[PDB]
Amino acid sequence: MNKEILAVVEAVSNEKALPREKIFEALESALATATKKKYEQEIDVRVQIDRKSGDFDTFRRWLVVDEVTQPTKEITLEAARYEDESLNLGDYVEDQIESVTFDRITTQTAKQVIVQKVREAERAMVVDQFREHEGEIITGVVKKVNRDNISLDLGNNAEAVILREDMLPRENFRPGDRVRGVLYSVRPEARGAQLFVTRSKPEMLIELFRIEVPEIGEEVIEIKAAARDPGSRAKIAVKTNDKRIDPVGACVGMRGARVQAVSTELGGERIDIVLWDDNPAQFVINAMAPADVASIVVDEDKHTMDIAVEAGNLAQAIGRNGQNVRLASQ
Amino acid sequence: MNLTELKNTPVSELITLGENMGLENLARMRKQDIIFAILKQHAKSGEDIFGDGVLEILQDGFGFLRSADSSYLAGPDDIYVSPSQIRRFNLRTGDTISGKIRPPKEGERYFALLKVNEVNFDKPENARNKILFENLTPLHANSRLRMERGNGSTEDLTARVLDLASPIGRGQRGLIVAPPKAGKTMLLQNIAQSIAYNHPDCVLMVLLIDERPEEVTEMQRLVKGEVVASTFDEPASRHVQVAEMVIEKAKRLVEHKKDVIILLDSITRLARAYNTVVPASGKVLTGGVDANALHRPKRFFGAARNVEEGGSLTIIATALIDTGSKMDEVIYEEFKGTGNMELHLSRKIAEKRVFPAIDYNRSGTRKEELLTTQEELQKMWILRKIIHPMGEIDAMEFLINKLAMTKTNDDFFEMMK
Amino acid sequence: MNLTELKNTPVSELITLGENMGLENLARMRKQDIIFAILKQHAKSGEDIFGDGVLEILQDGFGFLRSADSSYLAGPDDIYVSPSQIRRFNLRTGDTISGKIRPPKEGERYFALLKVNEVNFDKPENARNKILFENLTPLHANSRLRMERGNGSTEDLTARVLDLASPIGRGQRGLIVAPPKAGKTMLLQNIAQSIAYNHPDCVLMVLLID
Amino acid sequence: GPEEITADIPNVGEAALSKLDESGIVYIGAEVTGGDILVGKVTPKGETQLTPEEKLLRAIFGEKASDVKDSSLRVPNGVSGTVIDVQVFTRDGVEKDKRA
Amino acid sequence: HYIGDLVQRTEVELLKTPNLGKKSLTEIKDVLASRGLSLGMRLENWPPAS
Numbered sequence A: 001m002n003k004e005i006l007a008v009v010e011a012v013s014n015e016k017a018l019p020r021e022k023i024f025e026a027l028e029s030a031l032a033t034a035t036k037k038k039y040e041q042e043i044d045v046r047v048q049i050d051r052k053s054g055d056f057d058t059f060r061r062w063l064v065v066d067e068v069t070q071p072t073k074e075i076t077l078e079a080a081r082y083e084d085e086s087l088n089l090g091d092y093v094e095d096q097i098e099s100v101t102f103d104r105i106t107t108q109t110a111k112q113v114i115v116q117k118v119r120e121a122e123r124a125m126v127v128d129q130f131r132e133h134e135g136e137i138i139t140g141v142v143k144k145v146n147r148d149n150i151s152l153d154l155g156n157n158a159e160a161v162i163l164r165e166d167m168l169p170r171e172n173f174r175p176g177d178r179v180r181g182v183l184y185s186v187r188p189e190a191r192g193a194q195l196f197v198t199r200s201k202p203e204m205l206i207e208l209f210r211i212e213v214p215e216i217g218e219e220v221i222e223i224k225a226a227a228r229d230p231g232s233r234a235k236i237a238v239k240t241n242d243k244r245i246d247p248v249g250a251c252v253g254m255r256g257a258r259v260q261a262v263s264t265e266l267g268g269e270r271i272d273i274v275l276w277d278d279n280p281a282q283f284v285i286n287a288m289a290p291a292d293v294a295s296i297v298v299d300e301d302k303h304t305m306d307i308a309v310e311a312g313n314l315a316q317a318i319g320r321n322g323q324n325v326r327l328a329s330q
Numbered sequence B: 001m002n003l004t005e006l007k008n009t010p011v012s013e014l015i016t017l018g019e020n021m022g023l024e025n026l027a028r029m030r031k032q033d034i035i036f037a038i039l040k041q042h043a044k045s046g047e048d049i050f051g052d053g054v055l056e057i058l059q060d061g062f063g064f065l066r067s068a069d070s071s072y073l074a075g076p077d078d079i080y081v082s083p084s085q086i087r088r089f090n091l092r093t094g095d096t097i098s099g100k101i102r103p104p105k106e107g108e109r110y111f112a113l114l115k116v117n118e119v120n121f122d123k124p125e126n127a128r129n130k131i132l133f134e135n136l137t138p139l140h141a142n143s144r145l146r147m148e149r150g151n152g153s154t155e156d157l158t159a160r161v162l163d164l165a166s167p168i169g170r171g172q173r174g175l176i177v178a179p180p181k182a183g184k185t186m187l188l189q190n191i192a193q194s195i196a197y198n199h200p201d202c203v204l205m206v207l208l209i210d211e212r213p214e215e216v217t218e219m220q221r222l223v224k225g226e227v228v229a230s231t232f233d234e235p236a237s238r239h240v241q242v243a244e245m246v247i248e249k250a251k252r253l254v255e256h257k258k259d260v261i262i263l264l265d266s267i268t269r270l271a272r273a274y275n276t277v278v279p280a281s282g283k284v285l286t287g288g289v290d291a292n293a294l295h296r297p298k299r300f301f302g303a304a305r306n307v308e309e310g311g312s313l314t315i316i317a318t319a320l321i322d323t324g325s326k327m328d329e330v331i332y333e334e335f336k337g338t339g340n341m342e343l344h345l346s347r348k349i350a351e352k353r354v355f356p357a358i359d360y361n362r363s364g365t366r367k368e369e370l371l372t373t374q375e376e377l378q379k380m381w382i383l384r385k386i387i388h389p390m391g392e393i394d395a396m397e398f399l400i401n402k403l404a405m406t407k408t409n410d411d412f413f414e415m416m417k
Numbered sequence C: 001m002n003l004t005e006l007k008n009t010p011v012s013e014l015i016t017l018g019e020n021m022g023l024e025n026l027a028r029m030r031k032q033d034i035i036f037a038i039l040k041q042h043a044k045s046g047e048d049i050f051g052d053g054v055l056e057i058l059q060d061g062f063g064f065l066r067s068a069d070s071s072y073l074a075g076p077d078d079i080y081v082s083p084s085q086i087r088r089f090n091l092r093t094g095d096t097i098s099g100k101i102r103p104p105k106e107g108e109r110y111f112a113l114l115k116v117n118e119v120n121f122d123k124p125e126n127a128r129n130k131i132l133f134e135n136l137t138p139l140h141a142n143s144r145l146r147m148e149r150g151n152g153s154t155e156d157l158t159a160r161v162l163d164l165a166s167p168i169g170r171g172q173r174g175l176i177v178a179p180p181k182a183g184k185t186m187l188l189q190n191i192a193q194s195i196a197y198n199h200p201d202c203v204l205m206v207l208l209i210d
Numbered sequence D: 001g002p003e004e005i006t007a008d009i010p011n012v013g014e015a016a017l018s019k020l021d022e023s024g025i026v027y028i029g030a031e032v033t034g035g036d037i038l039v040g041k042v043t044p045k046g047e048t049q050l051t052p053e054e055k056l057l058r059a060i061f062g063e064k065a066s067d068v069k070d071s072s073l074r075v076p077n078g079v080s081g082t083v084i085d086v087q088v089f090t091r092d093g094v095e096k097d098k099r100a
Numbered sequence E: 001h002y003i004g005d006l007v008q009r010t011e012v013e014l015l016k017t018p019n020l021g022k023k024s025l026t027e028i029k030d031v032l033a034s035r036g037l038s039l040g041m042r043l044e045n046w047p048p049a050s
């Protein structure tokens, strides 16, 4: 039987996604489940099946504790001083040997455990490999655009997910196109696809500029703020700590060429490079531009800003659902 | 029942005891399983069993307590120890353990430990509060080792020559450069006798690698010390195993504030074993030597030092030359600028039957000012200046002939003026 | 908490601090993971952590900040740095970095850098506007190094001999040709003492191999 | 290719295959009422290139068994009973399975 | 010789008696497992009525 175990551990399909010690622990867990299904009672068994060459030599766990419930895995602290245990937990002794690791039900449960383990393997591997590209934009065709979320093929058995809440009624989907974003959260302890990528976050566009805008990335300029009402308005507020560059003149390109390109990349969303100031007053003055404001007031105890607008430029002051204001408050 | 008691017994006494117990013929099999079976019987009907030895950690987590009379070999004599001890008392590779044992139950064949009585001749409570080995602060030789007995027999003069050629202290690294057939064996024997006679307080250990069994037998029953050795009828695995175990034992013992002095003969055979046991890393040197094959021998040699916090470790390893191979020269060249106490034995003097054949001109000790007083070291300098312009054979001729009449070394210094 | 503070502490003081924290016996293991575990605890309950060292770039893009007291060795003491720093401040092999660090989260074992406070004892802004090494214009020795102290002790005379045998200045290449057992060790020791006493402004480094 | 008695039977649920052991033969003392499987015979209806790696992969992963045709013998329709003994004869050279 | 005299005691004394190894101890502790009662109890009504 040991020869078959060695053949199995050697001829695994994914030698890179399922490392050798992982095969060892998977076989150990499978044999543990087999031995559990063997006896009528509930007794957990560790295997440690001679990792390199030899066969199995099982054990018997006993869980040192003053309890008695399920006495198969019970050893009281007072009645444990023999065998030189002397401890309070970890009495995994070799009281049990002579397991059968090949019969029908054992082989079936071992195949099932192996499937679960290779799935867990693939998951952890793809997640902790493609998680390095969390701040930078990822590429890849979609697996399937379901209702609650969409799943995207990032490459060799590589998968990501984009949630439904971050989607748009006008943003448009079917298996086979590639939609990008920013990997915003990774939950490696989940039960399935755990590579969560969003598209509505502001820093997205910032990262986007880091691919196109050469002024950003070298710290010579400073992209500070990004007000993003997805589908409505995506404005950016940058700052220049140097003394030979313009905040809006350089990053705009040549009469709406690079900003228009990244707008079409973001979905044709209206993008206006705004210039924030060191004070919130001029900041909200510029965020609601081009328009006039009859009153700018700041309130700290209320955590609010009163912006009263004059009449004459309403068509540029409110817009749709107060979008020109909705970014500022956001 | 103590294990070391049945250990120091010859095989005939074990046979007589087994026949007194009235069992199957035990004289037919190994001393190992002889002791195993008599212990199994006497423990079926007998007290708590007691045992002692040195511990080695396995890659499974558990450990094996083995005996030095079996040169720390695997067999039924070993004592199984669980990783729970290595968590509770946090056991280590090379700990001198002594405690209570019992027979193995159903299906087991190794005696199980019950309760540690002495860990490195010390308290387990005090076994926690200890200092790490490489975490120590090494220092130069501070206390000198007195090798002169003062009787002046036919062989003691040999040691006296060392006392004026290259003084040794606790924490010093000694390296002996000698071709075959030069009389280094009884050189180490006389040195061991002198340092065991003058200092019975420091635990003294010798190491023989790829040596003939005759010298092993005659040494393991003539001097004091756990005389552990490795004969050439075993592969490099056993030799490197003895290396590991005794070096770890010495490390733990100096960590317990004890002066350990290790006698190795020879370091070249041990390094050859290291080379033939280590896997090839692609880089070959002249003579089939790996670059990584000298890393562990260098570790073994450099483990010796003089601790500031307490205790010391002094190693005296011998090196072979002039025997023809490529490995001997490459190893001796690699180890030349490592030790701070060279002792050169020229065969050109041994061919004339002038013993001991010591190259006094090519020998010396760095930092020798911290071992002798001002006038002692001054007399050493004056005598070195006197004897240096002379040749080799005539130099040792004059040295031995003038040390023959006078009997104490300071008296020799006085009469040399 | 500064790393170099626990670095200059002996092992006994680390043991006492770990026992004062009330944890598993830390004296049992390496100084490396001793400092690692005490830092993990004190950072579970403690301020921002601070650290310093020299950076080495790996072939994966990331970098390791290591300590000279460990002679720039790999171990749990190291500080992980992302390639994003090596793009933003454009980090380099051998930069003396000092900045804020934090414990590693789930599954990680290396302390992560937060914000570079000093790059080569200097500003990161001024770390950009720098000159390349081989792009420099070398020159002969212009300023001489004064090795004579003026006290004339038993060993200082040794240095004085050098001052009349082979004068050294900043930028000179010195090569010592000596057989074994010639007294070069304390020769370098006296030279280092003299150049450290006379010039405490130039950073002085020694190298011992094998 | 020669036919084998492996327990690799596709296009059938695990419940119907529970009556067989790992070698594909029903346990001694397992009653059967209706038409059910009792000997797991499969024959290769295709070509060569059936590697042992592919064998061990198909048992755990992969698509259905390509060339089997489900040549396994089932108990005839209507007849029932309880199995009490099994006999196997093997041509020399062929290694005996676990039940033999 | 009685189950009520064995339920009211722990196995710390079972291993004290020689020839009480892995077979007997596990068998005893598993037979009572199928019976629900626990090895080692506290009852004062003993023995009624013997």
Ligand SMILES: Nc1ncnc2c1ncn2[C@@H]1O[C@H](COP(=O)(O)OP(=O)(O)O)[C@@H](O)[C@H]1O
Residues within 6 Å of the ligand: B154, B155, B180, B181, B182, B183, B184, B185, B186, B355, B356
């Ligand atoms: N102190 C001594 N007195 C008399 N003979 C000696 C003395 N030391 C060495 N010898 C001679 O030298 C030989 C030593 O043999 P051996 O131990 O094999 O030398 P080595 O150990 O140098 O190979 C012996 O035959 C012995 O006669």
Ligand SMILES: Nc1ncnc2c1ncn2[C@@H]1O[C@H](COP(=O)(O)OP(=O)(O)O)[C@@H](O)[C@H]1O
Residues within 6 Å of the ligand: B366, B367, B368, B369, C154, C155, C180, C181, C182, C183, C184, C185, C186
């Ligand atoms: N300035 C000095 N005064 C007195 N003795 C000295 C002086 N310099 C060297 N020595 C002697 O020379 C030896 C130098 O030893 P070592 O440092 O090993 O030399 P090297 O470094 O050349 O091998 C010492 O034993 C010491 O007694």
Ligand code: BEF
Residues within 6 Å of the ligand: B179, B180, B181, B182, B183, B184, B185
């Ligand atoms: F023992 Be001899 F020096 F070969």
Ligand code: BEF
Residues within 6 Å of the ligand: B337, C179, C180, C181, C182, C183, C184, C185
């Ligand atoms: F070997 Be010495 F230090 F020149």
Ligand SMILES: [Mg+2]
Residues within 6 Å of the ligand: B181, B183, B184, B185, B186
């Ligand atoms: Mg010899």
Ligand SMILES: [Mg+2]
Residues within 6 Å of the ligand: C181, C182, C183, C184, C185, C186
């Ligand atoms: Mg020197």
